[PDB]
From a paper:
Here, we were able to distinguish two conformations of Bcs1 after 3D classification that differed from previously observed yBcs1 classes. Notably, our reconstructions showed a substantially narrowed matrix vestibule of ~20 Å in diameter as opposed to ~40 Å and ~30 Å in the ADP or apo states, respectively. This dimension is incompatible with substrate binding at the matrix side and coincided with a wide-open seal ring of 30 Å diameter (only 15 Å in the ADP and Apo1 states) large enough to accommodate Rip1 during translocation. Moreover, the basket TM helices are in a defined position and clearly resolved in ATPγS1, occupying a similar position as observed in yeast ADP or Apo1 states, tightly held together by a hydrophobic seal in IMS leaflet of the IM. The two ATPγS states can be distinguished from each other mainly by the orientation of the middle versus the AAA domains. While the conformation of the AAA domains is essentially the same, we observed a rotation of the middle domains of 6° degrees against the AAA domains, leading to a shift of the middle domains by 7 Å away from the AAA domain in each protomer. Of note, in ATPγS1, the CH forms a contact with the large AAA domain of the neighboring protomer (D124/N125 of the CH with K250 and S253 of AAA), but this contact breaks after the transition to ATPγS2, concomitantly leading to a higher flexibility of the CH loop. ATP binding results in at least two intermediates, here described as ATPγS1 and ATPγS2. We propose that the first intermediate, that we never observe with a bound Rip1, may occur only at an early stage of the translocation.
Numbering used by the authors:
A (entry chain D): 84 to 160, 167 to 324, 339 to 453
B (entry chain E): 191 to 324, 339 to 350
C (entry chain E): 84 to 136
D (entry chain C): 244 to 324, 339 to 403
C-alpha cells in the first residue's frame, strides 16, 4: 500500500532540496548547517548560517498525505547521493505536483538579481550567490549600438515560429569585438538583466573540457539563459568539434550565445560564418557621445562643466577608453570640477 | 521492445554520438529539415538523391558482382554553403538517423573505430564532419572505410 | 518451475526499458524521476518529468 | 575612499572592487607596505600564487569568491604567469568576479604585463614604488636613529 519514488543526481534533484528547505509544514530531524554569502546594501556581512534538512529521514505533510523523505549518501559524498520519497496511500499523483512546485521555485528568478552558471563537468552549476542586475542605462555604448542589439535580440526571441517554418535552426550568435575596456562584458550583464535571463559562462581553454562534454553542456543549458564565450580567440577541445557545436547536426536549439574578443582578426572565417555568428558589432574606444553620456551618468544635472569636459577630451586627442573615463570619475567622486582638472591624467598610460 | 525503439517519430531524426565503443542517442530528436528548404545548385540535389536511391535499391546487384555494399559521399566547398544542411535534409528524407563521429576525439582508437563503424543502428547515415581535420591512425581509418 | 532471462547493458536493454516505460499494464511500486525536454514548436521548449520504474 | 563609498558604487552599477599595483625595483618596500596597510585596516591577507601548477580557472574563481571577510587579496609577482590568461582576466573583472574585495599586485617588471591586465577596471591604482629618494634616506635614518 506504499509507492516509493527516487531521483538521482539530475536537474530535478537540487530543485527538490531547495523546495524541501522552504517547505513550512515540515518535521525534520537530522538537520545540517550551510553557510552562505548573504548581502546588505551597505556591506555584505556574509556567512549566515542556514539549517537544511540534510541526510536522514524527514516527515512533510504537503497536501495531506504525510510523505516520508529520506536523504542518504553512500561510499562517497558530488558522487553517490540520492533522496527518496514514500507515500502511504498510493497517491503518486502528488509526486508530479511536488516536482512541478520544486521546478517553479527553482526557476523563479530573483527580481533584481542575475544568476551565473559555470561549467562543472558535463553539467552546469550555480556559481556563488546571484549578483545584482546591471541596468542597461548604466552601460554607455555608442549611438544605435545598444538599440540595434536590443532590437535584434527581441526580433529573434519573438519570431520563434518563423524560424521553424523555413527550417532555419532557432539559434542566434552575437560577437562584441573591440579594445579592452569598452563595455562588452558590462553590456552582457546588462542585457541578461534586461531579458531576465541567466548567464552560462563557458571557458573553452579549460583543459578538462572535451568535445562530447562541450556538446552536452551546450545542449543542457538551463532554461532562460545566455551562453557566454569570453575570449573566443583564446582557443582539449577540437576546432571542428567547436564548429559543429556552434552550428551542426549536434547543435542545440533556442539558445543565445555571446562571444567577445579583443583580436577579431585571430578568428577563422569558419567561426565567423553568418550562421554561427549572425551579428557582429565593434565596441570601440570612447567617442564624444560616449564621453558626454558617461559624464552625465556620473555627474547628473549640470551640463556646462560636461561641455567643458568633452571639449578638453577632444583637445587631448587621445584614444581614451570608457574604462579609463570610469576610473577618472571614480577618483573624483561628486567633484566634476576635480575631474575637469584631472582630465589631463587620461593621457598617461604607465 | 525492438519495434518500439526502432520506430521513428513521424517528423524528427535521431542523432547518435560515439560514446566509447558503441553509439547512443544524443539529446531529444530534432525536427526533420525538408529538402526544398536546402537551396543547392541545379542538378546537385537531384543528382545526389538519384545516386542514393540507386544505391539503396540495388542491394542484390552489389552482392552478385562481389562489390562491398557500401557507398561514400564527399561534400566539399566553402564554409556556409549547405553541406551540413543537406546532410540533415537527406537523412530526414530517407527517415535515417545521423551517426556523427568525431575522429579528432583523442580517446578514439582504431579498434574502437572499427567497432563503432560495425555497430551502427539500423537505417542510419555515418557523418564524418571535417574529414580533413585528422589517436586514430591513417592506415586504420583507411582500412575501416574500405 | 520458473524461468529467468537476464540482459545487461545490451542494445536491447535500453529498448526493454523504453518498452517497460510505455507498458500500461505495469504495476510498479518503485519509481524514478528523470527530467526530459518536451520540445514543441509553439511557444518555447520546456522540461518535463518522467516517472520511469 | 573606496571602503567608505559602498553604496555609491551600487547606485551607478560599477562593481564594488578595486585593484592596486605596486611596481618598482626589488627592496623598495612593496611587500612591507602591503603588510603595514593590512595591519592598519585590521584586515587579513590572502596570498595567492598564480604560478602554482595545480591551480585551475574554476578553482581560482572559487578562491577569489570564497575569500574570508575583511581580507586583502595579494598577488605577488603578477608578471610571473595551469591557469589561463583569459580565465585570470575574467576572474579579476568579469561576470564571475566577486564583490567588495581589495586586491594588491606587485611586480618588478610592469612592462611584462598586457594592456588587458593593466585595464583601469582591473588595476585601478598603479603607483611606482622606486629606489630611495633623499627624503626616504632622511626618514629611514630618523626611524633607525631617532
Ligand atoms: N561603456 C561603458 N559604460 C559603463 N561602464 C563601462 C563601460 N566600459 C567599461 N565600463 C566599466 O569598466 C569596467 C570594464 O568593462 P567591461 O565591460 O567589464 O570589460 P570589457 O569592456 O569587456 O573589456 P575586456 O577586458 O575585454 S572584458 C567595468 O567596471 C565597467 O563598469
Ligand atoms: N543552400 C542553403 N540553403 C538554405 N540554407 C542554407 C544553405 N546553406 C546554408 N544555409 C544555412 O546556413 C546555415 C549553415 O549552413 P550549413 O550547411 O550548416 O553550413 P555548411 O555549408 O555546412 O558550412 P560549414 O561551416 O563547413 S558546416 C544554416 O542556418 C543553414 O540553414
Ligand atoms: N621602504 C621601506 N621601508 C622600510 N623597510 C623597508 C623598505 N624597503 C625595504 N625594507 C626592508 O627590506 C625588506 C624588503 O622589503 P619588501 O617590501 O618585503 O620587499 P620588496 O620591496 O617587495 O622587494 P621584492 O623583492 O620585489 S618582494 C622589508 O621587509 C623591510 O625589512
Amino acid at each position: 500500500i506504499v509507492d516509493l519514488e527516487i531521483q538521482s543526481k539530475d536537474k530535478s534533484y537540487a530543485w527538490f532540496l531547495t523546495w524541501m528547505a522552504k517547505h513550512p509544514q515540515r518535521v525534520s530531524r537530522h538537520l545540517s548547517v550551510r553557510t552562505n554569502y548573504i548581502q546588505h546594501d551597505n556591506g555584505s556581512v556574509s556567512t549566515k548560517f542556514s539549517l537544511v534538512p540534510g541526510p536522514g529521514n524527514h516527515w512533510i505533510r504537503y497536501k495531506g498525505a504525510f510523505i516520508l523523505i529520506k536523504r542518504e549518501r553512500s561510499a562517497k559524498m558530488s558522487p553517490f547521493e540520492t533522496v527518496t520519497l514514500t507515500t502511504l496511500y498510493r497517491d503518486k499523483h502528488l509526486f508530479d505536483d511536488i516536482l512541478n512546485e520544486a521546478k517553479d521555485i527553482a526557476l523563479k528568478t530573483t527580481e533584481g538579481k542575475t544568476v551565473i552558471y559555470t561549467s562543472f563537468g558535463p553539467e552546469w552549476r550555480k556559481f556563488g550567490q546571484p549578483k545584482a542586475k546591471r541596468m542597461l542605462p548604466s552601460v554607455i555604448l555608442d549611438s544605435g549600438i545598444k538599440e540595434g542589439i536590443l532590437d535584434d535580440v527581441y526580433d529573434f526571441m519573438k519570431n520563434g515560429k518563423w524560424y521553424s517554418d523555413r527550417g532555419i535552426p532557432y539559434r542566434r550568435g552575437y560577437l562584441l569585438y573591440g579594445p579592452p575596456g569598452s563595455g562588452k562584458t558590462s553590456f552582457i550583464q546588462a542585457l541578461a538583466g534586461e531579458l531576465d535571463y541567466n548567464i552560462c559562462i563557458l571557458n573553452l581553454s579549460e583543459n578538462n573540457l572535451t568535445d562530447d562534454r562541450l556538446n552536452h553542456l551546450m545542449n543542457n543549458m538551463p532554461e532562460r539563459s545566455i551562453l557566454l564565450l569570453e575570449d573566443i580567440d583564446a582557443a582539449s577541445v577540437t576546432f571542428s568539434g567547436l564548429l559543429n557545436a556552434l552550428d551542426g547536426v549536434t547543435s542545440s536549439e533556442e539558445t543565445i550565445t555571446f562571444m567577445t574578443t579583443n583580436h577579431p582578426e585571430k578568428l577563422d572565417a569558419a567561426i565567423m560564418r553568418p550562421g554561427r555568428i549572425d551579428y557582429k558589432v565593434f565596441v570601440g574606444n570612447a567617442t564624444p557621445y560616449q564621453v558626454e553620456k558617461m559624464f552625465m551618468k556620473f555627474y547628473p544635472g549640470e551640463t556646462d562643466i560636461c561641455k567643458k569636459f568633452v571639449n578638453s577630451v577632444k583637445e587631448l586627442d587621445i584614444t581614451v577608453s570608457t574604462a579609463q573615463l570610469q576610473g577618472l570619475f571614480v577618483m573624483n567622486k561628486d567633484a566634476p570640477h576635480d575631474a575637469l582638472k584631472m582630465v589631463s591624467s587620461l593621457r598617461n598610460a604607465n
